[PDB]
Structure formats: structure tokens, C-alpha cells
Design a protein around this nucleic acid. Structure first.
Lengths: 184, 222, 50, 122, 49, 57, 158, 147
RNA sequence: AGGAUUGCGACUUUUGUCAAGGAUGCUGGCGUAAUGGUUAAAUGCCGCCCGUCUUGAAACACGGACCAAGGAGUCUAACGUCUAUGCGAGUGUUUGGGUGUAAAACCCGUACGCGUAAUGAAAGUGAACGUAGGUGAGGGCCCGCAAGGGUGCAUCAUCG
RNA sequence: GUUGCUUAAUUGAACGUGGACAUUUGAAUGAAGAGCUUUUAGUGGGCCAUUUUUGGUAAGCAGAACUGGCGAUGCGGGAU
RNA sequence: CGCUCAAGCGUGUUACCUAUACUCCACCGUCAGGGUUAAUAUGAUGCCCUGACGAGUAGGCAGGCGUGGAGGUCAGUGAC
């Protein structure tokens, strides 16, 4: 038989979480039910994000949440993070807001609830909004990681070499400048 | 729970309207084929009286069959067989005949036998070995409710209406032919009428163009 | 179990409602045709026979 | 009406050269050879175990009776099989003493539970 | 000897290092010896710090 | 004694993985372009930024 | 040793022509090149400055930069199992305009005329290009055109 | 865990994940960075550069003590002041009563400009300062004392 | 094969009937070594001796008389990608001290390592014109009966 | 509209602001989902066939070109 | 083996034999696309539906079977 494509191919996606956590899999069952039933695009996005790894779920700073509120016509939207929400000390006037996430830090709990906010978890959000109405999903920065700078090293890529320490006398002389042979 | 019992009486009444629409259309298509055959036969007799030769219109539709099996096939003809959906040995399709499609058949002529079918061989293939492509998944054409659900936007509200598009070569041949899954045929019951299968029809073998004799070969395999 | 329209007949009549009208009037036969003219030739038989 | 059992391949898969040399036991073991004919599948040689020989899912782990066997060592271990006589049969262990078999066999026959062994030494 | 895309390490283990290895199993037991020594000294000296 | 060179199973290897086109983008890479042109081009984009800012008022 | 120079195996490629030696006609220099035009390449044996390597004879590419005497042309070439972008700098004497894109611009204007004209009259356009269809039926007249009976000739020695 | 490794799974097969032709011999290439200039040049031309050679001049008896000076951005600045005394100070200090921020006690050398601080008088104490860092503090109201 | 019903239909004046989304009906013999299971021999056809290096082994290529037990990718110091867990601009109790049912379990904190700033050989200097900037793509949400418009995180390209 | 480029210039050239034209997304056929990233194994002695072909009297000899096989592969036929 | 108006050589026309190939049905596994605890006992890792595919050395990953010791648990089995 002329096999055009590969046979018995895998889906190439995380179906369920690799984690064995009891409380997380309860949250999966709730959103997995909604994604089949509701027919609201919001629910199918949050179903994907619960399956992700620690690298694929970066931390969202509270200053990043404050920027999205300045968008023209998005003052009272329930901002749904899928990860951790860390505190930030490069800002002062944090407004009265409502947030939804898996985890909140000890600092970020105080910063929201001092202004008079609502630190909600994803199950409590699902009671108010099944379809996801007047929501606003936020995702943290992937490619600012210490491993990301070393990927795809070579001539003349403009990337960082994998080394321990540190300044001169360590990957500087021959092959990095015209005085000593050449500049890569 | 309640009123859904009354819907059983209702929903049946709307299908009685559709069966009348199928019956009148099938009567119209029968009148098209009978007039098409009689017009060509009498037109020859018209020309023969006035010291002239009627030349018939060239074939608008052709049916291909994979003869050679797998392996030891060069890459260029192997690519063309992949495009015409003849991946397995003994496989059908139908091809809308153009100048462009004729050049594809020249490349793969040792590995296939092909000719011009009629409203008879086409009727048997779509009933006995007919299968539809419905969100992938090779699903059979048991009921005509399946064909209306998918191909309802281009007319084609029945199995015979799908057959009409294949035979006449209408504007929606490209959509209607691609809907059909390639016909997985059996080996011929009588035989190939030869000692050797790979020599071209006119010399002795099976492959290449055979025009009128493809109808006999398919009915045995059907 | 996929039946087959050619055999069985109830599956045939599930499709093509015209199968009654085809079979009753005998359209796989149809008398048919015609005098007026057995209508002949001119110089075709000279080239054909030669 | 219970599905009739078909075993596909009843003959035992012996290892290659088990009868030839004494040290090679009859427990199955895959040939990892390059000259080997058992790996490459030649005509007129021993068969190999393959997933195609697997039994039907309707009738798996069932004997001639049509019952899945459970191992029992005492009277308290009979309490899962009280309302499941047609589906689950019992079997008493080898390490149980002679007098304790009479204790299990007595209360087993009350509820109508079929034991594969016993019989019971005598 | 070398070659993927890994950092160039510096492991100084080309002498007879296995002959001169120490493992501190005594950490837990040696703590009690010091607490015993500090206590027994205070008993000898008595009223002084 | 040893074989020198060949190109057998070479094109067959290449077509397994891909043989791909070079992607293409809108706004291509502006490298190896005339330096006198680029300096004036910078001042044009700076000036037109002032124009659109004044319009929105 | 093996020879792998810059102008290796260029005996007939950079050979000039039959009865077209010497100077070049002035229309070569007069032609205009804006950033975007498609152009085919032909090396000229007489002009030695800004000369292309043998591989790019007959290749086609888009112009990206323009200067005093030259034009920058990016050409995609195959190597290993992956296409790479390459940047050339050839003088005006070698480059000429491509006539492949020429026919496309004729088709754009004609379709716009047919859509605008027919919508206020016909209500039926048919603007997609048709492949060469098969024949229709017809009748051939035999009056003063009677068939000539042929036969295969016997073998002779010239 | 000894059971989870792949050497348990290889029991039965001859080569054990090393091939029949390659054999797995002792030291085919060398022993650690051997032949860097000869037959491992293609590895070191890629991936590393600047490996061989020597840039710069020597320092005899160098001490990590003269070279100290840990930096501090103006973004952080207010973190040195306590958490209780913050909502109080941010709302009305207004001169003659500004919160003194000694950077050296916390452990910082050079006060350094980056962030955009709020308009409150500060009075900072530090060893070193940037030119931009002083401009931002004077715009607010305060001053910089040297030590 | 399947194992309540649901669907498409046909024949029906009608109720109903049916070859219509996979076999039901009626009858006989035996109720056990008779049917099956393993095991040994006979008969038909087929079957060269394993392991190994090799483009290539039944080989006139190497090891193997036979059996039992033993017998071969382990542990460590620095590390890379991916994954789970805890806290998160911080993080790390266990050098050491306090206690104790005593190598355990529990508690304590100055330092110090890595991270929060880079670039230069060094002397050194040291990251907001603008809503932390525009353009093209972008999931999701918002307005709308729709057509379409508004707002656009991650990321990719691109000019500042 | 934009400028320090270019013009005898109120020209040109790049990047734009607003505007008109979506059945007829402007050849055929197919699409098995498309694009992309990290990481690491074995391998780096090859050989035979149909045409093209160099050395050689010629070779189950040596050496290249294009597809297909064996090596990694049983099964029916060529007795083997 | 034996064959001579062949059981030989060239050519034609029919029947017939037959592969793990082709068509159809049963069962196994792998992969994909769906449907469902809306109290509704027993494994949501469940319970069903539909469609395709299956050779393989060097190599990689997955799911299981067994051996010697350690913590828990069946108030497990045993001079009957």
C-alpha cells in the first residue's frame, strides 16, 4: 500500500496533565465538561492551558495586569491568568480589580485586597461565568528564559555561548576578533 | 418527552414531500438520457443521406484502473498515481477529460488501464461499491439522507442526482467526484483475456487506452 | 450490515422511487420506434464497398 | 446464550533448540540472531507469539465453565462471591490444612458456589 | 573527548583521589561530644561563665 | 583500495524530511542597501510621525 | 590536481555570439530599474566588471537595491535539503526585463473590464481560464472532396 | 532507582544500545579536549569561539574587595524604607521631614538611574552616583549626600 | 457477528403485515469418553546448526563433548535539555547552635552562593522624546440580527 | 502627505493618509491536518540490476552518472 | 523419466490449476475523530459509537513478567 503519510501517528499534544495532583484533575474534569457542552471558545482555551508544563506557564507580574486595564474600553473585565501571580514593587496606583488564577503569592494577595479587589480561583469564576463573558485572558512572557538565549548558537546568529565563568581569559581571543585571526 | 411523540407524525410528512421531488427529477433525467442516445443515432442517418460523415463528440469522462501493484515504480509516475488516488492495486476514480489531465495519463500508462464508461457501469459502481468521504472516515452510501446533508449546497439531493453529475460532467464534478472514496474493486471473475498482463491492449496485454472495452472489464470486477 | 441495492428490492425501493414506474411500463424494452422512412443513402456504399 | 469460546492457537510456544540441547529450557525466549531462521520466518519452522493470537474480550480469563477463578485461603475470603455464582468460581489454596478445607467446602456449598478443585484429598 | 554543545568543565581528578577521601559520618555523634564537653567543663569550673 | 565519491541515495534522503521554500515575509530585511538612501529614509519616517500625531486632535 | 576556479567550464557560456562582437547597443543602458521588478540574467563576455558566476546564468530574481551602475538582485538556490537567500551585485549590461510577469498584468486589466461591462448587461462573466477542452460533434462535406484510397508501398533500393 | 533505568530493559539483546559495528571501545577520540587544534577544530570553530589565545594584561595579587560596588536601580530605591512607613510617606512628606535612605547599611555602593520615581523629597546617602540618577532626584525635590 | 424500543421504507381500503438498522422455526439421537484436550507412533507435503565479524555463511570461516552454580554500562565530582514538586524578586533549616522517646524527628539565625545590569584590555562610565514607540500578522473577549467594526496578551518579522 | 535623498523645477524615488472593486479567493489535480522548536541514538568498509559511460584484448576487473533493489525481507515462480 | 502428424520449433483460439496479493465476513492490537452521572452503586483511569492501518537488523520510546532485602496492610497461611 502506498503510504503517503506516516502510519499510527500520535496527536503531538498534551491530552491530560503529566502531574498526578488530585485537586488539579478535579479542575480539569469541570472545564473538560464545559468545553464539550457549552460551545463557547473561551472554555476550550482554558482547557489547553491547564495541561501545560512549568516552563509553558510563566509567572504574570501584577504590573503586567495593570497595563491591560489601560486598554481603551477594558476597565471592569475579569482578568483570567492561568499560572502564578507575583507581586511587583515598580508601581503604586493599582486599581480596584477582579482576578482569576491557579495560585497567588503572599505579596500579591495583599496588593489586590488592599485596594478592594477579588482574588478568585478558577472554580469560583466558573460559577459566575460559564461561557466566559466580559473576560480578558493574559499570558506571561515565554522567551525571556535563561535557557532561551543559548538556543541556535553559531556564526553569525547573535546568541549566548554555554559557559560557567565569566569575563576575560574565557572565550574572547581567537575567532572572536580581527586582531587574533578573525571575528567568527 | 411530550410533543416529541406528535413530532413522529410530523417529521414523516415532510419526507413524503421530498420523495415526490426525487421521483419527478428521476423521471426528467430518464428523459435526458433517452433523447441523448436517439439524437446521436438519427444524426448519423441525417448525414449519411446527404453524402456526408457525422463525426461523434469526443469523450468527456474517463475511468481509470490500477493494474500494477506496489514497489519498483519510479518517482515521477509514482507521484501522479498519488494525485489520482490510485494508491492501492485495483482502484477506481473517474477523471474529467481535458488536455491537462490527458498528459498525466501518458506518464502512468504502463501501470493503468482506462476507457470511456456509460450510464450502466456507473450505475452499478455507485450502488454496489459506493462509499462517501464524510469528515475523513470511509462511510457507506446506504441512505440518500447522507448525500443531502453534505452535498445539499450544489443541488445533489439524492444518489441518482450524484450519478447525474458524474455521467453528464456538470459544473460540480470536482466537488462531487472528490466526495466519493476511490472504488476498491475485486479481481476479474472471468479473467483478463490474455496470457500476460503488461503489454498494452493493442499489442496483446491489458494496460493503456481501450475506449469501449473498459465496460466489460469493470462489470466482471464489480 | 450494508445490504446492496441491486438485490433485495426493499433497499432498491428505499432509493429510486422511480423503480416502480420503470418496472411497470418496461423501460428496459420500450417497444419502440418507427416507420415513416427507412431512409437511405447516396454515394456512401461505393466508398464503403469499393 | 453465552458466547462460545475459541482458543485460536492451543499448541504451546516452545523455545528453539529446547529438545536438541538439555540446558535450553522450554520457556519462550526471542531469537536475537543474524543467521537465525526463526526470527526471519522461513517456511516449515516453529511459530512465534504475536498479538494476533489474543483471545476474545467477551470471553477472556474464563474456563470451560464460563467463570473467572478466584483464589481463597479462608472462610472470610468467600464473601466477595456471594451474589456472583454464575460469573465467579472459587479455588482453595495448596498451603491450607486438611481440616480447614472441610470448613470452607461446607459453607461454600450452602450459597451454591462452584469450586474447581475439591474433590479434597480423601 | 569533547563535542556536542556543552560548557567546558574543569574537573581536577587525575591524582590518586580515592585514597584521600573523607566522608563525615561523625557529624551527628561529634555534636554530642561537644555538648558533653561544654557541660562537663561547667561542672568543673562551677560558678563562673 | 577505497571508494572515492558517489551521489547514491542522496536526493532520496533530501525528499524524506522536506525540500522547503524560504518562508517569505512582508517587510523584508533591509541589509546590503545604499547608506545614502537609508539616512534620508530615516528622516522621512521621523517627519511623517509628527504629521499623523497632529491630525489626531 | 583538480581544477575549481571562478570561470571554470565557461568555454561556450561567456562566448559572445556569431556576428555580434564589439560594442553594445545603447538601449541596454537606458532601461530603468525600480525596487520590485523581476529580471533574467545573461552574462556578456566583453564586459568583465560586475560579472555573474556561472550558476546564475538563466536564473530569475527580484530587485532589492539600486545604485550608480548596478542593481542588487536576490536569488534563491537549492543546497543540501534547504533553500538559501543570496545577494548579488551585477552591472546593468548583464540584466534584462522578464516577460513572464508581462502576461499577468494584461489579464488583470481585461478581467476588470469584463466584470464592469457585463454586470450592467449580461449577468454572466466566466473569467477563470479554461483548459483546452475536447471536440464537439460536426459534419464534413464530401462534395468535391472524395476520399483518396491509399496503400502501403513495396520495398525498393532507393 | 535502579529498576527504572534502560540497562534493565536491554537484558536479552547483544550490543546493549551500542551497535555491532562501532563496538564501544575505551577511548576512540582521546582524553578530554585532546586534539583541539587538529581533529576537534570543527567542534571548537562552532559553538565556542575565542578559546585559544590571550587578550589583555595581567593583575598580580588581585583581591575581590577593591572591586566591590553592588548597584541599585531607582526602581528599587523605596524598598529600603520599611513597609509600615510607606503609605504614610508617599502621601505628604513636603520638605523639612523627608525619609532618610542610607544605601550602604542595606549593602549597596552606587545609586544608579533606571526607573521613574514619584514626586516626593527623598534625601539619599550613597558612596557613588550616576549623572542621570542625580537629575531624577532633584526633579522630585531631594538631594544626594556623599560618604 | 449483534442482543428491550428508537431509523429508512414497502405492501396495506383500514387496522396491521413484511425478505425493511446481522437466524429464527420444527424434529431426532446421545447424555458419556461419544465430541474436544494433551501425549506417543504412522502416513502426505515442507524443514541444512546455532552464536558471530562481514557487501555476502549450511559453509572446506572462527567458539561450542555434556551438566550444575558463579559471570559483564556500576558508583561519584562538576554539568546540559526535558519533567514533577515547593516558595516566588527572591530562594537555600542540617558549617554551626538549641533540644530529644537519641546517627532519627523538631526548632534557630548571622553570614555566604546563585539571581535582581551590563560593557571595556584597562582607567572607567552605566539603560523612558512618545501611554515603555510605530507597521504587518495574531488567539480570546466587546458591539451587532448578520455583513462588518472595536480592543488586541503570548510569539514571529521589521524599522526606530 | 512626508525629507537633510534627487531634480532646471511646484520633478522623481521610498514609506504613507483617506477612496473605489469580493458569487466571478481570477488554470488542472490532490491535501493523509499546517508551520515551528529543543534534544539525543546508531552510521560514516557498502553491493547488484536496466539504460548513459571512462581505462582495459578481456574479467564474477577497476571507476563515475539517473532511478530501482539487496544489506534490514519472508511469501508464489526461475529444478537448485 | 521418456517423447517423433511430439510430450519438439513458429503462430492463433478457448477452458483449467494456483500466492501471506485483490474483494467480503469473524476476532486481536495500535492510532485518530466523536458521544455521555442531568440523583440516577460496582473502575470518569469508566461506559459506548464510527473509521483507517499492521514486514523489519543497527537504533529510540512505551506497557508488563520474575529475583534478594526495606516501610505499610490482609487481627493472611502453617507440625492436623
Amino acid at each position: 500500500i502506498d503510504h503517503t503519510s506516516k502510519q499510527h501517528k500520535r496527536s503531538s499534544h498534551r491530552t491530560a496533565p503529566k502531574s498526578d495532583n488530585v485537586y488539579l484533575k478535579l479542575l480539569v474534569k469541570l472545564y473538560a465538561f464545559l468545553a464539550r457542552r457549552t460551545d463557547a471558545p473561551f472554555n476550550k482555551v482554558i482547557l489547553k492551558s491547564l495541561f501545560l508544563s512549568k516552563i509553558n506557564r510563566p509567572p504574570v507580574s501584577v504590573s503586567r495586569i495593570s497595563r491591560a486595564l489601560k486598554q481603551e474600553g477594558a476597565a471592569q473585565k475579569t482578568i483570567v491568568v492561568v499560572g502564578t501571580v507575583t507581586d511587583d514593587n515598580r508601581i503604586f496606583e493599582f486599581p480596584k480589580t477582579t482576578v482569576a488564577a491557579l495560585r497567588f503569592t503572599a505579596g500579591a494577595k495583599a496588593k489586590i485586597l488592599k485596594a478592594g479587589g477579588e482574588a478568585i480561583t478558577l472554580d469560583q469564576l466558573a460559577v459566575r461565568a460559564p461561557k466566559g463573558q466580559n473576560t480578558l485572558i493574559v499570558r506571561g512572557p515565554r522567551a525571556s528564559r535563561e535557557a532561551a538565549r543559548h538556543f541556535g548558537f553559531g556564526p553569525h546568529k547573535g546568541k549566548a555561548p554555554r559557559i560557567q565563568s565569566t569575563g576575560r581569559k574565557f572565550e574572547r581571543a581567537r575567532g572572536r576578533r580581527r586582531s587574533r585571526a578573525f571575528k567568527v | 418527552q411530550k410533543t416529541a411523540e406528535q413530532v413522529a407524525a410530523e417529521r414523516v410528512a415532510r419526507k413524503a414531500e421530498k420523495r415526490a421531488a426525487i421521483l419527478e427529477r428521476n423521471a426528467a433525467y430518464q428523459k435526458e438520457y433517452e433523447t441523448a442516445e436517439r439524437a446521436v443515432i438519427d444524426a448519423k442517418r441525417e448525414a449519411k443521406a446527404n453524402s456526408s460523415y457525422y463525426v461523434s463528440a469526443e469523450a468527456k469522462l474517463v475511468f481509470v484502473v490500477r493494474i500494477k501493484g506496489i514497489n519498483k515504480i519510479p518517482p515521477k509516475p509514482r507521484k501522479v498515481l498519488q494525485l489520482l488516488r490510485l494508491n492501492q492495486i485495483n482502484s477506481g476514480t473517474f477523471v474529467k477529460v481535458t488536455k491537462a489531465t490527458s498528459e498525466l495519463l501518458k506518464l502512468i500508462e504502463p501501470y493503468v488501464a482506462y476507457g470511456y464508461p456509460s450510464y450502466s457501469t456507473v450505475r452499478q459502481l455507485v450502488y454496489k461499491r459506493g462509499y462517501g468521504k464524510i469528515n475523513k472516515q470511509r462511510i457507506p452510501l446506504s441512505d440518500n439522507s447522507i448525500v443531502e446533508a453534505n452535498l445539499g449546497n450544489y443541488g445533489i439531493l439524492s444518489v441518482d442526482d450524484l450519478i447525474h453529475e458524474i455521467v453528464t460532467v456538470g459544473p460540480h464534478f470536482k466537488q462531487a467526484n472528490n466526495f466519493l472514496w476511490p472504488f476498491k474493486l475485486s479481481n476479474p471473475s472471468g479473467g483478463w483475456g490474455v496470457p500476460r498482463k503488461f503489454k498494452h491492449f493493442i499489442q496483446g496485454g491489458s494496460f493503456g487506452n481501450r475506449e469501449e472495452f473498459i465496460n466489460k472489464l469493470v462489470k466482471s470486477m464489480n | 450490515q450494508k445490504k446492496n441495492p441491486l438485490k433485495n428490492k426493499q433497499v432498491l425501493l428505499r432509493l429510486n422511487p422511480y423503480a416502480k414506474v420503470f418496472a411497470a411500463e418496461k423501460l428496459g424494452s420500450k417497444k419502440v420506434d418507427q416507420a415513416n422512412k427507412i431512409k437511405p443513402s447516396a454515394t456512401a456504399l461505393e466508398t464503403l464497398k469499393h | 446464550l453465552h458466547p462460545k469460546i475459541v482458543k485460536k492457537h492451543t499448541k504451546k510456544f516452545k523455545r528453539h533448540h529446547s529438545d536438541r540441547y538439555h540446558r535450553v529450557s522450554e520457556n519462550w525466549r526471542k531469537q536475537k540472531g543474524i543467521d537465525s531462521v526463526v526470527r526471519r520466518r522461513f517456511r516449515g519452522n516453529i511459530s512465534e507469539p504475536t498479538i494476533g493470537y489474543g483471545s476474545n474480550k467477551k470471553t477472556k480469563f474464563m474456563g470451560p465453565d464460563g467463570r473467572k477463578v478466584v483464589l481463597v485461603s479462608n472462610v472470610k475470603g468467600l464473601t466477595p462471591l456471594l451474589m456472583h455464582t454464575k460469573t465467579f468460581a472459587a479455588e482453595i489454596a495448596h498451603n491450607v490444612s486438611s481440616k480447614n478445607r472441610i470448613a470452607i467446602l461446607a459453607e461454600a456449598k450452602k450459597n451454591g458456589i462452584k469450586v474447581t478443585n475439591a474433590k479434597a484429598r480423601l | 573527548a569533547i563535542s556536542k554543545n556543552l560548557p567546558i568543565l574543569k574537573n581536577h581528578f587525575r591524582k590518586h583521589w580515592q585514597e584521600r577521601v573523607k566522608v563525615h559520618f561523625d557529624q551527628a555523634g561529634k555534636k554530642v561530644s561537644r555538648r558533653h564537653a561544654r557541660a562537663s567543663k561547667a561542672a568543673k569550673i562551677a560558678p563562673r561563665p | 583500495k577505497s571508494k572515492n565519491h558517489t551521489a547514491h541515495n542522496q536526493t532520496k534522503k533530501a525528499h524524506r524530511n522536506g525540500i522547503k521554500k524560504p518562508k517569505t515575509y512582508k517587510y523584508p530585511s533591509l541589509k546590503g542597501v545604499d547608506a545614502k538612501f537609508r539616512r534620508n529614509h530615516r528622516f522621512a519616517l521621523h517627519g511623517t510621525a509628527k504629521a499623523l500625531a497632529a491630525k489626531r486632535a | 590536481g583538480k581544477s575549481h576556479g571562478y570561470r571554470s567550464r565557461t568555454r561556450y557560456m561567456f562566448q559572445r555570439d556569431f556576428r555580434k562582437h564589439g560594442a553594445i547597443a545603447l538601449s541596454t543602458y537606458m532601461k530603468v530599474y525600480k525596487v520590485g521588478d523581476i529580471v533574467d540574467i545573461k552574462a556578456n563576455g566583453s564586459i568583465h566588471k560586475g560579472m555573474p558566476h556561472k550558476f546564475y546564468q538563466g536564473k530569475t530574481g527580484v530587485v532589492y537595491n539600486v545604485t550608480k551602475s548596478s542593481v542588487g538582485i536576490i536569488i534563491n538556490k537549492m543546497v543540501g535539503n534547504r533553500y538559501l537567500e543570496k545577494r548579488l551585485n551585477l552591472r546593468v549590461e548583464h540584466i534584462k526585463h522578464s516577460k513572464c510577469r508581462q502576461e499577468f498584468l494584461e489579464r488583470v486589466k481585461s478581467n476588470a473590464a469584463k466584470k464592469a461591462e457585463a454586470k450592467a448587461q449580461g449577468v454572466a462573466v466566466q473569467l477563470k481560464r479554461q483548459p483546452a477542452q475536447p471536440k464537439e460533434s460536426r459534419v464534413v462535406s464530401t462534395e468535391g472532396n472524395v476520399p483518396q484510397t491509399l496503400a502501403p508501398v513495396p520495398y525498393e533500393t532507393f | 532507582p535502579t529498576r527504572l533505568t534502560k540497562t534493565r530493559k536491554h537484558r536479552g539483546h547483544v550490543s546493549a544500545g551500542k551497535g555491532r559495528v562501532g563496538k564501544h571501545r575505551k577511548h576512540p577520540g582521546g582524553r578530554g579536549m585532546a586534539g583541539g587544534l587538529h581533529h576537534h577544530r570543527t567542534n571548537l570553530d562552532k559553538y565556542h569561539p575565542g578559546y585559544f589565545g590571550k587578550v589583555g594584561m595581567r593583575y598580580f595579587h588581585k583581591q575581590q574587595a577593591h572591586f566591590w560596588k553592588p548597584v541599585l536601580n531607582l526602581d528599587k530605591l523605596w524598598t529600603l524604607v520599611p513597609e509600615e512607613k510607606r503609605e504614610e510617606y508617599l502621601k505628604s512628606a513636603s520638605k523639612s521631614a523627608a525619609p532618610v535612605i542610607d544605601t550602604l547599611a542595606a549593602g549597596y555602593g552606587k545609586v544608579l538611574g533606571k526607573g521613574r520615581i514619584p514626586d516626593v523629597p527623598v534625601i539619599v546617602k550613597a558612596r557613588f552616583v550616576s549623572k542621570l540618577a542625580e537629575e531624577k532626584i532633584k526633579a522630585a525635590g531631594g538631594v544626594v549626600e556623599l560618604i
